[PDB]
Design a protein around this ligand. Structure first.
Ligand SMILES: [Ca+2]
Ligand SMILES: [Ca+2]
Ligand SMILES: [Ca+2]
Ligand SMILES: [Ca+2]
Lengths: 22, 92, 92, 22
Protein backbone atom coordinates (compact mmCIF):
# COMPACT_ATOMS: atom_id res chain seq x y z
CA UNK A 1 0.00 0.00 0.00
CA UNK A 2 2.57 2.64 1.07
CA UNK A 3 5.36 0.81 -0.80
CA UNK A 4 6.87 2.78 -3.73
CA UNK A 5 7.27 0.73 -6.94
CA UNK A 6 9.61 3.39 -8.40
CA UNK A 7 9.21 1.98 -11.94
CA UNK A 8 11.50 3.42 -14.66
CA UNK A 9 14.76 5.25 -13.84
CA UNK A 10 17.84 3.49 -15.25
CA UNK A 11 19.07 3.29 -11.63
CA UNK A 12 17.06 0.04 -11.65
CA UNK A 13 20.35 -1.49 -12.88
CA UNK A 14 21.23 -1.76 -9.17
CA UNK A 15 18.35 -4.23 -8.73
CA UNK A 16 20.00 -6.44 -11.37
CA UNK A 17 22.96 -6.92 -9.00
CA UNK A 18 20.55 -7.39 -6.06
CA UNK A 19 19.72 -10.85 -7.47
CA UNK A 20 23.07 -11.67 -5.86
CA UNK A 21 21.97 -10.34 -2.44
CA UNK A 22 18.97 -12.70 -2.56
CA UNK B 1 45.50 -25.88 -11.66
CA UNK B 2 45.52 -25.29 -7.88
CA UNK B 3 46.43 -21.76 -9.00
CA UNK B 4 44.33 -20.53 -6.08
CA UNK B 5 47.49 -18.92 -4.62
CA UNK B 6 47.95 -16.52 -7.56
CA UNK B 7 44.24 -15.67 -7.44
CA UNK B 8 44.33 -14.49 -3.81
CA UNK B 9 47.42 -12.38 -4.44
CA UNK B 10 45.82 -10.70 -7.49
CA UNK B 11 42.57 -9.93 -5.67
CA UNK B 12 44.58 -8.05 -3.04
CA UNK B 13 46.75 -6.31 -5.69
CA UNK B 14 43.82 -4.42 -7.29
CA UNK B 15 42.60 -3.37 -3.83
CA UNK B 16 45.94 -1.64 -3.15
CA UNK B 17 45.60 0.47 -6.32
CA UNK B 18 42.54 2.33 -4.92
CA UNK B 19 43.08 2.09 -1.15
CA UNK B 20 46.51 3.76 -1.43
CA UNK B 21 44.90 6.40 -3.67
CA UNK B 22 43.51 8.27 -0.61
CA UNK B 23 44.52 8.41 3.07
CA UNK B 24 42.14 5.53 3.95
CA UNK B 25 44.83 3.00 2.93
CA UNK B 26 43.46 0.41 5.40
CA UNK B 27 39.79 1.45 4.92
CA UNK B 28 37.49 2.29 1.96
CA UNK B 29 34.88 5.09 2.05
CA UNK B 30 31.67 4.80 -0.03
CA UNK B 31 33.41 7.53 -2.02
CA UNK B 32 36.65 5.61 -2.58
CA UNK B 33 34.54 2.50 -3.19
CA UNK B 34 32.77 4.24 -6.08
CA UNK B 35 36.14 4.92 -7.75
CA UNK B 36 37.04 1.23 -7.53
CA UNK B 37 33.73 0.24 -9.13
CA UNK B 38 33.33 3.05 -11.69
CA UNK B 39 36.95 3.65 -12.70
CA UNK B 40 38.49 0.16 -12.34
CA UNK B 41 35.46 -1.57 -13.92
CA UNK B 42 35.30 0.70 -16.98
CA UNK B 43 33.72 -2.11 -19.06
CA UNK B 44 34.20 -5.32 -17.04
CA UNK B 45 31.17 -4.46 -14.84
CA UNK B 46 28.29 -2.00 -15.34
CA UNK B 47 29.85 1.34 -14.35
CA UNK B 48 28.00 3.31 -11.67
CA UNK B 49 26.42 6.55 -12.96
CA UNK B 50 24.86 7.67 -9.64
CA UNK B 51 26.46 7.59 -6.19
CA UNK B 52 23.05 6.53 -4.80
CA UNK B 53 23.71 3.03 -6.17
CA UNK B 54 26.83 3.02 -4.02
CA UNK B 55 24.77 4.08 -0.98
CA UNK B 56 22.50 1.06 -1.43
CA UNK B 57 25.52 -1.20 -1.83
CA UNK B 58 26.89 0.41 1.34
CA UNK B 59 23.92 -0.97 3.26
CA UNK B 60 25.19 -4.40 2.22
CA UNK B 61 28.98 -3.72 2.47
CA UNK B 62 28.73 -1.20 5.32
CA UNK B 63 28.81 -4.10 7.74
CA UNK B 64 30.39 -1.85 10.38
CA UNK B 65 27.65 0.69 9.56
CA UNK B 66 30.29 3.48 9.51
CA UNK B 67 29.68 4.50 5.88
CA UNK B 68 33.06 2.88 5.14
CA UNK B 69 33.72 -0.76 4.16
CA UNK B 70 37.03 -2.15 5.47
CA UNK B 71 39.36 -4.04 3.10
CA UNK B 72 37.86 -7.22 4.57
CA UNK B 73 34.36 -5.97 3.68
CA UNK B 74 35.51 -5.02 0.16
CA UNK B 75 36.87 -8.55 -0.31
CA UNK B 76 33.44 -10.11 0.18
CA UNK B 77 31.90 -7.95 -2.58
CA UNK B 78 34.38 -9.41 -5.07
CA UNK B 79 33.40 -13.02 -4.36
CA UNK B 80 29.66 -12.44 -4.85
CA UNK B 81 30.01 -10.48 -8.12
CA UNK B 82 32.36 -13.16 -9.46
CA UNK B 83 29.62 -15.72 -8.92
CA UNK B 84 27.64 -13.72 -11.51
CA UNK B 85 30.70 -14.05 -13.77
CA UNK B 86 30.33 -17.86 -13.65
CA UNK B 87 26.96 -17.52 -15.40
CA UNK B 88 28.64 -15.34 -18.05
CA UNK B 89 31.97 -17.20 -18.08
CA UNK B 90 30.52 -20.70 -18.49
CA UNK B 91 33.58 -22.90 -19.09
CA UNK B 92 31.64 -25.31 -21.37
CA UNK C 1 46.30 -2.90 -12.64
CA UNK C 2 42.50 -3.21 -12.90
CA UNK C 3 43.39 -6.87 -13.45
CA UNK C 4 40.25 -7.70 -11.47
CA UNK C 5 38.88 -9.45 -14.60
CA UNK C 6 41.63 -12.10 -14.66
CA UNK C 7 41.20 -12.63 -10.92
CA UNK C 8 37.50 -13.53 -11.18
CA UNK C 9 38.17 -15.93 -14.04
CA UNK C 10 40.95 -17.70 -12.10
CA UNK C 11 38.87 -18.05 -8.94
CA UNK C 12 36.23 -19.89 -10.98
CA UNK C 13 38.87 -22.00 -12.82
CA UNK C 14 40.12 -23.76 -9.64
CA UNK C 15 36.51 -24.45 -8.59
CA UNK C 16 35.92 -26.38 -11.84
CA UNK C 17 38.88 -28.68 -11.10
CA UNK C 18 37.13 -30.18 -8.02
CA UNK C 19 33.44 -29.71 -8.86
CA UNK C 20 33.81 -31.67 -12.11
CA UNK C 21 35.71 -34.33 -10.14
CA UNK C 22 32.43 -35.84 -8.84
CA UNK C 23 28.83 -35.79 -10.11
CA UNK C 24 28.03 -32.66 -8.03
CA UNK C 25 29.43 -30.45 -10.83
CA UNK C 26 27.08 -27.57 -9.85
CA UNK C 27 27.23 -28.35 -6.08
CA UNK C 28 29.96 -29.21 -3.51
CA UNK C 29 29.46 -31.77 -0.71
CA UNK C 30 31.33 -31.37 2.62
CA UNK C 31 33.21 -34.38 1.25
CA UNK C 32 34.14 -32.78 -2.08
CA UNK C 33 34.86 -29.56 -0.18
CA UNK C 34 37.47 -31.36 1.92
CA UNK C 35 39.31 -32.44 -1.25
CA UNK C 36 39.44 -28.82 -2.44
CA UNK C 37 40.89 -27.69 0.89
CA UNK C 38 43.19 -30.64 1.69
CA UNK C 39 44.38 -31.62 -1.79
CA UNK C 40 44.42 -28.24 -3.61
CA UNK C 41 45.92 -26.40 -0.62
CA UNK C 42 48.76 -28.87 -0.07
CA UNK C 43 50.96 -26.10 1.44
CA UNK C 44 49.24 -22.80 0.56
CA UNK C 45 46.78 -23.24 3.49
CA UNK C 46 46.89 -25.48 6.58
CA UNK C 47 45.74 -28.85 5.21
CA UNK C 48 42.79 -30.46 7.00
CA UNK C 49 43.70 -33.65 8.93
CA UNK C 50 40.21 -34.38 10.32
CA UNK C 51 36.89 -34.17 8.47
CA UNK C 52 35.37 -32.74 11.67
CA UNK C 53 37.05 -29.42 10.84
CA UNK C 54 35.12 -29.50 7.58
CA UNK C 55 31.88 -30.16 9.49
CA UNK C 56 32.42 -27.00 11.55
CA UNK C 57 33.20 -25.03 8.41
CA UNK C 58 30.02 -26.51 6.94
CA UNK C 59 28.01 -24.75 9.64
CA UNK C 60 29.40 -21.53 8.18
CA UNK C 61 29.36 -22.50 4.45
CA UNK C 62 26.31 -24.77 4.69
CA UNK C 63 24.13 -21.71 4.20
CA UNK C 64 21.43 -23.88 2.62
CA UNK C 65 21.86 -26.23 5.59
CA UNK C 66 21.86 -29.24 3.19
CA UNK C 67 25.35 -30.46 4.14
CA UNK C 68 26.44 -29.19 0.70
CA UNK C 69 27.75 -25.70 -0.15
CA UNK C 70 26.79 -24.50 -3.65
CA UNK C 71 29.46 -22.99 -5.94
CA UNK C 72 28.15 -19.58 -4.80
CA UNK C 73 28.70 -20.61 -1.15
CA UNK C 74 32.20 -21.91 -1.97
CA UNK C 75 33.04 -18.56 -3.56
CA UNK C 76 32.45 -16.68 -0.31
CA UNK C 77 34.91 -18.91 1.59
CA UNK C 78 37.68 -17.86 -0.81
CA UNK C 79 37.20 -14.13 -0.16
CA UNK C 80 37.38 -14.43 3.64
CA UNK C 81 40.50 -16.65 3.69
CA UNK C 82 42.21 -14.29 1.24
CA UNK C 83 41.70 -11.48 3.72
CA UNK C 84 43.97 -13.48 6.04
CA UNK C 85 46.46 -13.60 3.15
CA UNK C 86 46.62 -9.77 3.20
CA UNK C 87 48.11 -9.95 6.71
CA UNK C 88 50.68 -12.45 5.40
CA UNK C 89 51.08 -10.89 1.95
CA UNK C 90 51.67 -7.32 3.15
CA UNK C 91 52.66 -5.43 -0.01
CA UNK C 92 54.98 -3.05 1.89
CA UNK D 1 29.83 -24.50 33.69
CA UNK D 2 28.70 -27.21 31.22
CA UNK D 3 30.85 -25.68 28.45
CA UNK D 4 33.70 -27.95 27.22
CA UNK D 5 37.07 -26.17 26.89
CA UNK D 6 38.45 -29.07 24.78
CA UNK D 7 42.06 -27.90 25.32
CA UNK D 8 44.78 -29.66 23.28
CA UNK D 9 44.00 -31.62 20.09
CA UNK D 10 45.71 -30.16 16.99
CA UNK D 11 42.18 -29.76 15.54
CA UNK D 12 42.34 -26.41 17.36
CA UNK D 13 43.87 -25.18 14.08
CA UNK D 14 40.24 -24.69 12.98
CA UNK D 15 39.84 -22.03 15.68
CA UNK D 16 42.72 -20.11 14.07
CA UNK D 17 40.56 -19.64 10.95
CA UNK D 18 37.54 -18.81 13.15
CA UNK D 19 39.16 -15.43 13.87
CA UNK D 20 37.80 -14.68 10.39
CA UNK D 21 34.24 -15.69 11.36
CA UNK D 22 34.38 -13.17 14.23
CA1 LIG E 1 41.53 3.64 0.79
CA1 LIG F 1 31.64 -1.00 7.64
CA1 LIG G 1 31.24 -31.08 -7.32
CA1 LIG H 1 24.19 -25.04 1.62
Amino acid sequence: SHLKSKKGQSTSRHKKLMFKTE
Amino acid sequence: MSELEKAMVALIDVFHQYSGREGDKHKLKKSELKELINNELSHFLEEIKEQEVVDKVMETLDEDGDGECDFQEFMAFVSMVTTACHEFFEHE
